[PDB]
Amino acid sequence: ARKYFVAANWKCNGTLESIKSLTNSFNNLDFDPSKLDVVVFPVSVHYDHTRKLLQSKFSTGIQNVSKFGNGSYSGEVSAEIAKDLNIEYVIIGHFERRKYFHETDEDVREKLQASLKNNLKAVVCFGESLEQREQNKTIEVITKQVKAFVDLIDNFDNVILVYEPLWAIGTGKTATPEQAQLVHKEIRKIVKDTCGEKQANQIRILYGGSVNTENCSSLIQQEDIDGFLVGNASLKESFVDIIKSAM
Amino acid sequence: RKYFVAANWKCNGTLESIKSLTNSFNNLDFDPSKLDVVVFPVSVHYDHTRKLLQSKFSTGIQNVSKFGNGSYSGEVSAEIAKDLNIEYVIIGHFERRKYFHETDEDVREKLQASLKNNLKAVVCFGESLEQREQNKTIEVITKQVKAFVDLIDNFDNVILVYEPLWAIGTATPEQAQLVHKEIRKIVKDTCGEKQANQIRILYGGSVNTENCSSLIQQEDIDGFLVGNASLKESFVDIIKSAM
Numbered sequence: 001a002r003k004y005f006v007a008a009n010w011k012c013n014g015t016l017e018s019i020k021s022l023t024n025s026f027n028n029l030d031f032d033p034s035k036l037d038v039v040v041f042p043v044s045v046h047y048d049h050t051r052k053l054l055q056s057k058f059s060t061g062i063q064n065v066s067k068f069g070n071g072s073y074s075g076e077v078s079a080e081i082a083k084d085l086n087i088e089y090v091i092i093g094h095f096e097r098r099k100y101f102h103e104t105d106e107d108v109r110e111k112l113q114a115s116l117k118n119n120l121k122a123v124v125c126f127g128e129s130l131e132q133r134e135q136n137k138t139i140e141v142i143t144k145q146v147k148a149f150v151d152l153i154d155n156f157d158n159v160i161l162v163y164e165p166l167w168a169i170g171t172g173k174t175a176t177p178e179q180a181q182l183v184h185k186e187i188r189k190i191v192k193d194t195c196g197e198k199q200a201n202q203i204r205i206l207y208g209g210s211v212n213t214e215n216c217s218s219l220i221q222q223e224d225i226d227g228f229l230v231g232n233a234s235l236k237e238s239f240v241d242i243i244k245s246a247m
Numbered sequence: 248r249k250y251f252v253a254a255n256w257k258c259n260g261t262l263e264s265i266k267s268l269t270n271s272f273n274n275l276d277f278d279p280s281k282l283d284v285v286v287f288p289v290s291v292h293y294d295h296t297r298k299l300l301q302s303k304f305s306t307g308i309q310n311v312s313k314f315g316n317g318s319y320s321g322e323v324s325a326e327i328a329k330d331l332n333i334e335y336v337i338i339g340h341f342e343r344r345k346y347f348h349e350t351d352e353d354v355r356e357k358l359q360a361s362l363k364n365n366l367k368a369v370v371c372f373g374e375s376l377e378q379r380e381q382n383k384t385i386e387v388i389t390k391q392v393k394a395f396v397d398l399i400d401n402f403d404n405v406i407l408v409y410e411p412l413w414a415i416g417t418a419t420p421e422q423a424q425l426v427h428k429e430i431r432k433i434v435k436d437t438c439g440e441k442q443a444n445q446i447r448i449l450y451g452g453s454v455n456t457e458n459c460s461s462l463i464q465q466e467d468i469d470g471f472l473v474g475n476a477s478l479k480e481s482f483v484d485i486i487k488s489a490m
């Protein structure tokens with residue numbers, strides 16, 4: 001069966017001290033890393049500090065990766081550099097990159113290609129806007145976004161999909177677990193259509209909308225939701241409850 | 248004003264290569280009270296690098312967020328840099344403007360955020376070949392500098408970089424010097440002559456052991472933002488040209 005996968009996307013947050021206290025409270029949770037993946041994504045300049053403090057049961061990665069490889073790309077972190085540093089995971093396609101930094105479907109594709117060439121594991125995010133949903137284009141947008149990279153997947157344990165319901169982020173709308181599950185089912189279908197039943201059955205599809213201690217159980221129970229990419233709630237000590245929801 | 252020699256490692260290095268490179272740098276005997284020497288590794292290499300380099304080397308990062316802390320996945324805030332005691336940031340490098348659509352307004356906002364968090368900034372600008380061909384060198388550089396020059400408080404703490412984009416992909420030291428003089432005239436007119444004679448203006452085109460002496464000797468060239476030449480142990484000779 002699929003291994004559940006609970007990730008903390010710390011986004012642009014943290015001090016040396018806050019990370020010391022937060023990582024201390026995460027270490028107190030017993031879990032079995034051969035049964036459940038728990039991954040923490042700190043800011044790049046916090047990675048060494050975070051990786052040292054978190055116990056080995058925790059996996060780690062970074063919040064973005066370059067499409068370009070090594071060379072004259074000031075400000076970028078290459079997949080080669082991540083591999084040399086044994087950084088296990090990268091997030092690609094997060095909506096904040098697509099919103100604030102003009103990241104395109106082709107950038108997501110090229111980042112995934114770079115990541116896989118360097119043996120990184122990729123958490124790849126996509127999802128449709130309020131306008132797109134209101135126009136009844138959910139499946140059309142998600143098909144387009146997934147087919148932008150899906151043919152590159154070389155091992156369905158090592159690329160993890162994230163559904164970001166942009167229509168329920170910053171909009172006042174809240175997605176029900178039923179609504180989230182429906183999209184997850186369709187996402188698994190796109191992978192079945194393009195890659196094969198056995199591959200669709202292996203791939204983890206995480207929910208990446210608002211996750212907190214109160215809704216996490218109702219989401220993880222859904223048949224096609226395999227875990228979470230968590231924002232704000234992963235900056236709290238109570239994140240451990242979100243991890244326990246998947247245990 | 249002191250000379251300023253910066254290593255922009257851009258997207259390059261391994262843990263092993265940085266060990267050997269940093270050890271060759273530490274072997275160079277120089278006085279940090281007379282010359283600033285700044286290494287800018289990749290964000291994920293910063294801690295590794297900072298630990299390996301003697302204090303005579305200042306260090307920084309190659310980019311900084313225009314937003315504060317919060318919901319900006321993949322960004323590093325000026326507040327975060329300050330908590331890590333990161334001394335310098337690069338802002339406005341032509342690679343950010345080119346590949347990542349960085350604008351003049353992004354540069355100003357990133358400079359505002361850096362100064363607010365006590366970071367010192369190396370801020371880059373420069374004109375394309377099309378612009379140079381149309382006699383727009385001064386007009387472009389004027390527009391780019393005026394985007395942020397009114398923010399500069401202590402003129403030791405913002406370092407200007409001229410990037411001759413028209414030549415990257417070289418400019419003569421004479422050609423470089425003519426631009427640098429114009430840039431200084433821009434700071435004089437907007438900030439005052441005392442401040443313009445205090446501010447460092449670095450050449451940010453191709454710099455290597457072949458041309459560094461010819462460039463630093465120019466009157467309005469105060470050092471360099473060095474690319475691939477700074478990934479080499481011979482970078483110590485580029486530093487020596489400014490000693």
Ligand code: NA
Nearest residue numbers: 220221222225
């Ligand atoms: Na489930």
Ligand code: NA
Nearest residue numbers: 463464465468
């Ligand atoms: Na000079």
